[PDB]
Design a protein around this ligand. Structure first.
Ligand code: NI
Ligand code: NI
Ligand code: NI
Ligand code: NI
Ligand code: NI
Ligand code: NI
Lengths: 566, 101, 100, 566, 566, 100
């Protein structure tokens, strides 16, 4: 028998050819494929499919998944597909068709007595976000990021100290050890960055051996050619990443001098547009290089009518400039430039900038990495129309290009894509379930390592979980020993070999970073463009092959006043 | 309707029934007030209270448990005492007994 | 006052509704959380007054109209649910399609 | 010398023959006995009794209690008695007369240097409540239940997932292990229920061996005769309880068919009236059976003028019915029935229903088990007058009958009455101290395993603990390692033998369930009635020996608007 | 080249000869010395001094500090000095000049790659406060005290039980063990007091062996000569302190009788003025004795126009007196006396009272020890003018005299001055950073064992840490295993020798008390006065060598309505 | 604002008193927590104004009468206590038998 497509979509979520608007943006996704067998969909409830001898089989726990997300509309770098997702032992087991092989055809995700169900019909499911520019200013940032759909946080710091307010550096073995111990308490996967600014390689090797998965070179600790060279030499020996905030002041040289010091070695450039820091006015030219993995921080994303006014003043307050000193004013005006801020949005749309990040509480908003990524995608569709790679009457390729910026590309840059960053078999089950009306803004469920870690929750004493007030509350995946089982602390290979986890009595599951040195711009999923980019020293105009790269500032954005109380 | 109100059965409760009692005249010869609790070993009260300490040996005040008797400077009272029970072993106070009696 | 966690949680809802009430009074079109808070707090006060569950399921539909809320807000709110202490104890009030 | 009875009651709390109103209800308790020796009461304070050489003795810690609750008015299934309660090593040591054997007569609870004091004069002391229908939707339910006077929570779930929103099932070894680990973080004793719906007994044995103390059979996973038979066969082998939510749809048979599948074996029937689920319209007939331990969930307790309106709509929202489909409307009307909802209150008063529970956030209120139990007792006294068992001008027997519903009867049903459920020597010291004006609504102190776990607490910076705002705050009994020492995680005999506590590194004290299979209706304290009950298929009228069982809906209830801010 | 002193002070904080007002008081401190080399100050930031090869050297972690507080204005009992503070392995490493010995002169605090920076220019840095009269009524008191600048809490209790509401006693091995376990969860250093009131020494030795660092003798447990003698005999054997709340009722003797029972042995007298408890009306005479370490509790500090009215009623409520009973009224009037309350402020100014404390939630405010100490210093400067010890046009000696009351003197009294109580090399790095406008009221940063434990923190999602709302939030130094590393649990020598830390699985660092018996009034830093003090039995007038000791009540105080929302 | 935990705790009390103030304005008889919050917040505002402890111990008794509260509420409240920052620092105000 037949069912209308509208009735099917209402009951099981959209299928092949149906389109869905992302939140209140102008972005539309189209279902590319559906892994189900029509008539054999699994639904849970009274008189439904997932019941003994029906959609639930007789298999032992070793022979069925621990969790099934039914009828999910998956949005990931690799496709926009309708499927069931199976989770087993806290990892993604399969993407396909769930059910009971005793009575159903084509089952790839067996459901048994040992299986829990998450109903994902009518929901969008994505991988957990990965933020690689975290300043560990306060531990409250973890819940704030998790609520926004970010499940992994890479950064540095020791709390609200001057060093951390300015830089993502956890300095020295003692603080690295204390922060790894504190990380067990937070419901996000964590990796730490050490202080990379030194010209004695042994002071860097000690930090890597203590546990850091990368080193941050920051101009506030001296981003000189000798310090950059030393950190990169150590990174090449120890398989860790180097993150760079370059010499804004051009004190030791210009951008070409920093690029010469790098000498073609792999490096992650933070806030590559330069408002967040870097050689003025031309750090943006780093995105032309094959060895550079460029990220943007979020306050400049997208360009709006309030951007320049907020930034000029935000910078003036951070650095204690005062608008009366001509040279402090000349400095502020050299860092905040409408020309590079507007070009940055286009460079993301073209795939020349590969990652998005926060720069949390240090010229960046920890809960807005995802929201701002989508605001840029919306603004670029409005201004530029369809991408050259786009097939069909949809925005699927633009969506895949942008989701890669906060998922797989940060994971590849930091050598953790073997554990996190995408919905792929064998990876940790860090998943975010979204209602389409709230996509990118307010998730329905956040899953860490196979357990729900945070979710909106209504009145605890109510007869059902939906009555008001509904607000985000930590779940069992965020409690004590269950949290430890469901999160990862990332360590360097040297720290894992030296028995740091045992010495510090770290309780969480441990993962070890690998592949930080071999990753290049060409490896950035959908974001491998190496443009021939220039910045005019006098006008700050950004050009690619002589063509002006610019955009217009937004007056109003989606994913904003419709959703937030303040 | 008063929430949690009591409806007490009217009457009286007799305290320390069947126990030996005695009466002693006590005077506070000190210049500061003295207050004695229901279970204190009466023979070991503040030395400024003048009375027959031999008669009071092994006794406490015969008053509701937890209440006390106050002696202002120069105040005189006749108090009623009740003998200690149980093992009749006194430890503590001014360390005058520290054993049976 | 011996406030239980459930009573403290309702204070948060009352506060969010105060924010919405002041914005509606300035003539703003309310957004999603403002609209949910405003209608939910209205129901809680109705229960405190001793209105019936049936009466409040209907009264809750006349708090906000489509012209008083941002575009798409009515579609974002297919129902509003809140529990309150009525004269006969805690009850659940569900307001279906509250904004038209 | 003599003291008036009014002055005595003001100083030491009520004594034999005095009566106390329970909160704002029409229920009055009468003191049946007093274990003190008049004149020898122990009171703590300046110039009071509990002092060195006076009410406090010279004994070593091994020879005195760790804690004494002085002058408590005990309300338990076994009596309404005035006594001191002694606690030693986190367990009830004695109920009797506290003091110093060196100077006081009849001392059974020795007080020494090692003894802490809780002043219970003028307070009612009860055992901690036991809720056996918990859906582990969120961890915040633990504090909500503890504040209400519930110290043990039995249920199932994995967080806010579809499976748990509908059923009390923790499916499979992986989730059972994670939830046992998460339980260490909560200040309540916990036991878990597994998913009982399977026809392969080995898939059930694996869950019991992983740690579950019972199995839940729920219609949403298929409550068929074969699944019920399989779960009961395993339960009989492994000494665990089976909880049942029967086939509302009558898909596999009618109530008689489920009773045939049960085959006289012990089973706990959840929401036996049927509004919460079960064979429509006659699951209530299960209370006639000797092997059935019947419970009610709380939204239908007591019957009120707003009950039907809230429920018809509460069910319509849960199942996504829509009032326009005649068959969805026919389903809703088959489950929500004024006739069974009204009969349920009378069946509790007669002792035909033996337990009360929540069904937390799944058609039940986690913080209202106790409050609603007393609201039913009040409504039944108003409508029915004195029980046949009542002696004296008081409500003592009705009070003992109802308190047993949330204390000893759930404990006996789940095989944990050797550890919890009553104020009895050797049991865990889970005690609730109530001011009579707030009895059943807002406790004065909640004690877990001998430590105060939660209590109302005023301004932290105030000169005394009473200034406003006063609200419930977790105490030392709810902190880290002290909490672990003061709570129990219940395990099956198989899990304890297999070393599950050591494997999972569970930190809390462990208790093992026993006696789930031998418990029968005749063992339900004061609630052993097996009525000859029938339900008319057309009218839904409930009759016992041909006599109509009904009640009238309340307009206003006690324990409601006088106490709660919202 | 030269810089003006005003421009220098704006850039690096005040230097020698500059004065700073303490909050909104009339107290002014003068910088006595500066350990820097002018022109070589270390400042952190963009283009600043602490950068690779500049102010940051090439040394390995073993050869540089973990943390530097730059340009701090230190205020401690020993001086008011401008210096950099180095912290290494959670302890104070040096007070001096920070930098890089490769390029800078006179460096005593080497900065390397392993060094974190706290910018203290323009801030006052003090040791963490030590409160020795804590009633453990609720665990929320720890965060409240920490926010106020108190890093160590000594006291007793088991939660909100009658015994603890009245006394600082943790009775018996079972409760001592549970409270030591609960202490691991709190971000303050903790030491416990046992119940000292017993005449059998073995019941006291068992409590010390269980872990208590002192014994409290309280009149509510019987403060008789025999109990005091027994506790002091045990204290002399076991190197622990005895705290005393004497017999207000004069039941066992007058103040001379308690002093005879003490027999010249060391004892800490709590609330020595007597409003908080003690022989009426003359417990204040104990401050004449060489073996007595006298403290004040804070509600009587300083004397104000609302003091007597609040206290007379505060006492009437605690003891349930009722203004209609002439003898209860006679008792209240014997304890609350304008004459001793007014004399107490002068006795603190003269150094006859040596410590300040709270008496938390039992006639004392846990968050106001520091604030009230400074309010007394202000009121005494206003009324009395300069102290005889004062040199210069400043209040430096008065400031050193008062800061010693809540830092070093409580530490010496309780045998923990080898670990905490002052900014001195080898001591735990418990430091408080204050903005001068908020000195003594609201700290900028609170550091526990080298990690920031609590600090004001703005919007978590903001682009910087300063936007509103700014409120105190726990930091990494207060999280799980990092907190355990950064706090101390103090134990007696007997408990440490008996392996109590291992038996209870205590996770925090352990410190052992020593020197409780040898400390005397002469050892109280700047507060060693032994006046010839008398109290008139009829008028309550306090005289020193026949001279009336009195003060006038304040109408308005600093550190009050300008700062607090309520 | 650098709000301490004690200041944040008093915000909860202020909010509970706003709920009570609006209910009393609708002519409802107040319950136990509403009555405690209303009188406590009144005292805190009196302290902010610079009234004396003695003056507020008397003024606190004239906020609510027996006719403005539910049956049994006056008996449930033998006293109300609250601390506030007076011009001379934090002080405790106890209002005895506030509702008659
Ligand atoms: Ni940067
Ligand atoms: Ni940054
Ligand atoms: Ni059910
Ligand atoms: Ni249920
Ligand atoms: Ni005291
Ligand atoms: Ni005290």
């Amino acid at each position: 028998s037949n069912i209308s497509r509208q009735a099917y979509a209402d009951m099981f979520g959209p299928t092949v050819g149906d389109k869905v608007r992302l939140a209140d943006t102008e972005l539309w996704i189209e279902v590319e494929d559906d892994l189900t067998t029509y008539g054999e969909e699994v639904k849970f409830g009274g008189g439904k499919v997932i019941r003994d001898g029906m959609g639930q089989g007789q298999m032992l726990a070793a022979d069925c998944v621990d969790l099934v997300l039914t009828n999910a509309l998956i949005v990931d770098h690799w496709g926009i597909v309708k499927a069931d997702i199976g989770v087993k032992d806290g990892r993604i087991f399969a993407i396909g068709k769930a059910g009971n092989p005793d009575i159903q055809p084509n089952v790839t995700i067996p459901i048994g007595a040992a299986t829990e169900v998450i109903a994902a019909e009518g929901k969008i499911v994505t991988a957990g976000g990965i933020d690689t520019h975290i300043h560990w200013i306060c531990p409250q940032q973890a819940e704030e990021a998790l609520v926004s759909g970010v499940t992994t946080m890479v950064g540095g710091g020791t709390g609200p100290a001057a060093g951390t307010h300015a830089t993502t550096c956890t300095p020295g073995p003692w603080y690295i050890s204390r922060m790894l111990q504190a990380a067990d308490s937070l419901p996000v996967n964590i990796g730490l960055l050490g202080k990379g600014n030194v010209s004695q390689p042994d002071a860097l090797r000690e930090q890597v051996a203590a546990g850091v998965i990368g080193l941050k070179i920051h101009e506030d600790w001296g981003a000189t050619p000798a310090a950059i060279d030393c950190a990169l030499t150590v990174a090449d020996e120890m398989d860790i990443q180097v993150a760079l905030h370059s010499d804004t002041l051009n004190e030791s040289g210009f951008v070409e001098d920093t690029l010469a010091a790098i000498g073609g070695r792999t490096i992650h450039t933070f806030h590559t547009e330069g408002a967040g820091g870097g050689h003025a006015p031309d750090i943006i030219t780093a995105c032309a290089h094959p060895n550079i993995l460029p990220s943007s921080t979020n306050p400049t994303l997208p360009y709006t009518l309030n951007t320049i006014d907020e930034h000029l003043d935000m910078l003036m307050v951070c650095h204690h400039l005062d608008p009366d000193i001509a040279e402090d004013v000349a400095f502020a005006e050299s860092r905040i430039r409408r020309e590079t801020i507007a070009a940055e949005d286009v460079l993301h749309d073209l795939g020349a900038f590969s990652l998005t990040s926060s720069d949390s509480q240090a010229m960046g908003r920890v809960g807005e990495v995802i929201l701002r990524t989508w605001q840029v995608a919306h603004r670029m569709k409005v201004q530029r129309g369809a991408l050259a790679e786009e097939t069909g009457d949809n925005d699927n390729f633009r969506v895949k290009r942008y989701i890669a910026k906060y998922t797989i590309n940060p994971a590849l840059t930091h050598g953790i894509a073997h554990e996190v960053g995408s919905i792929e078999v064998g990876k940790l089950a860090d998943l975010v379930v979204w209602s389409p009306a709230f996509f990118g803004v307010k998730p329905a469920t956040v899953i860490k390592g196979g357990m729900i870690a945070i979710a909106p929750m209504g009145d605890i004493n109510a007869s059902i979980p939906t009555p008001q007030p509904v607000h985000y509350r930590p779940m069992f995946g965020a409690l004590g020993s269950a949290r430890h089982h469901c999160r990862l602390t990332f360590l360097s290979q040297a720290a894992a070999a030296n028995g740091v986890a045992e010495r510090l009595n770290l309780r969480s599951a441990i993962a070890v970073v690998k592949g930080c040195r071999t990753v290049q711009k060409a490896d950035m999923v959908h974001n491998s463009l190496q443009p021939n980019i220039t910045v005019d020293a006098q006008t700050y105009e950004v050009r690619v092959d002589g063509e002006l790269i610019t955009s217009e500032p937004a007056d109003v954005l989606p994913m904003a006043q419709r959703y937030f109380l303040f | 309707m008063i929430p949690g109100e009591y409806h007490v059965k009217p009457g009286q409760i007799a305290l320390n029934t069947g126990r030996a009692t005695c009466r002693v005249v006590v005077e506070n010869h000190g210049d500061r007030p003295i207050q004695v609790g229901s279970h204190y070993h009466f023979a070991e009260v503040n030395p400024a209270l003048k009375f027959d300490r031999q008669q009071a040996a092994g006794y406490r005040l015969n008053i509701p448990a937890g209440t006390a008797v106050r002696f202002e400077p120069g105040q005189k009272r006749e108090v009623e005492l009740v003998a200690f029970a149980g093992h009749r072993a006194v430890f503590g106070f001014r360390g005058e007994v520290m054993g049976p009696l | 006052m011996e406030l239980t966690p459930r009573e403290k949680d309702k204070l948060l809802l009352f506060t969010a509704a105060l924010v919405a009430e002041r914005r509606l009074a300035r003539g703003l079109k309310l957004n999603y959380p403002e609209s949910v808070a405003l209608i939910s707090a209205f129901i809680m006060e109705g229960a405190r007054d001793g209105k019936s569950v049936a009466s409040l399921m209907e009264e809750g539909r006349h708090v906000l109209t489509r012209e008083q809320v941002m575009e798409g807000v009515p579609e974002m709110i297919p129902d509003i649910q809140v529990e309150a202490t009525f004269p006969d104890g805690s009850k659940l009030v569900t307001v279906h399609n509250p904004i038209i």
